[PDB]
Write an enzyme that holds these catalytic residues in place. Structure first.
Site, PDB file in Angstrom:
ATOM      1  CB  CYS A   9      -1.017  -0.088   1.147  1.00 19.62           C
ATOM      2  SG  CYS A   9      -0.282   0.308   2.809  1.00 19.62           S
ATOM      3  CG  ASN A  12       5.030  -1.736   4.803  1.00 18.97           C
ATOM      4  OD1 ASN A  12       6.167  -1.995   5.144  1.00 18.97           O
ATOM      5  ND2 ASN A  12       4.119  -2.634   4.779  1.00 18.97           N
ATOM      6  CB  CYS A  14      -3.134   1.457   7.279  1.00 20.60           C
ATOM      7  SG  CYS A  14      -2.872   3.045   8.149  1.00 20.60           S
ATOM      8  NE  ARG A  15      -4.767   0.789   2.463  1.00 20.36           N
ATOM      9  CZ  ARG A  15      -4.790   1.548   1.378  1.00 20.36           C
ATOM     10  NH1 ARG A  15      -5.710   1.359   0.429  1.00 20.36           N
ATOM     11  NH2 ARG A  15      -3.843   2.488   1.237  1.00 20.36           N
ATOM     12  CB  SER A  16       0.689  -3.508   2.909  1.00 23.39           C
ATOM     13  OG  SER A  16       1.522  -2.545   3.520  1.00 23.39           O
ATOM     14  CG  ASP A 126      -5.369   4.904   3.611  1.00 20.95           C
ATOM     15  OD1 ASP A 126      -5.216   4.407   4.771  1.00 20.95           O
ATOM     16  OD2 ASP A 126      -4.555   5.733   3.177  1.00 20.95           O
TER      17      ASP A 126
END
Length: 154
Positions: A9, A12, A14-16, A126
């Protein structure tokens, strides 16, 4: 042969890191972690060295999914060495396609992680400006998509 996936993302944090942690747990639980190289990285350099967003870490603890990560930026080498690079949204996809055309060896298939969801939510949005409920959504999408990817890659 070892298989490899890089979750990506923008920063690096939050999501990934959640996708990486979820995917690692899936392969560890099926005894095949030794057969998989699993990592996450950022398209940008804003958060390099930082741990995951505290809210994502809290989400992961609630779910007992193991997460421990230092933010890093994607490198040219990553396009040569990873089989799959799985990103979160359209901006990530555009940036990664841009970067993959500035290197000579692009082994990796670059896709949206959401393209694997049985429930058909293509974008993993996000959660940075959201709240704890947005982190939960992200976690649930990652579980669905990581399962499907593990079962059968495009």
């Amino acid at each position: 042969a070892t298989k490899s996936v890089l979750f990506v993302c923008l920063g690096n944090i939050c999501r990934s890191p959640i996708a990486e942690a979820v995917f690692r747990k899936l392969v560890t639980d099926q005894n095949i972690s030794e057969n998989w190289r699993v990592d996450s990285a950022a398209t940008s350099g804003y958060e390099i060295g930082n741990p995951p967003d505290y809210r994502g870490q809290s989400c992961m603890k609630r779910h007992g999914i193991p997460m421990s990560h230092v933010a890093r930026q994607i490198t040219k080498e990553d396009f040569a060495t990873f089989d799959y690079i799985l990103c979160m949204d359209e901006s990530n996809l555009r940036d990664l396609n841009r970067k993959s055309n500035q290197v000579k060896t692009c082994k990796a298939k670059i896709e949206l992680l959401g393209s694997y969801d049985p429930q058909k939510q293509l974008i993993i949005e996000d959660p940075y400006y959201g709240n704890d409920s947005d982190f939960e959504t992200v976690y649930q999408q990652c579980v669905r998509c990581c399962r499907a990817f593990l079962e059968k890659a495009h």
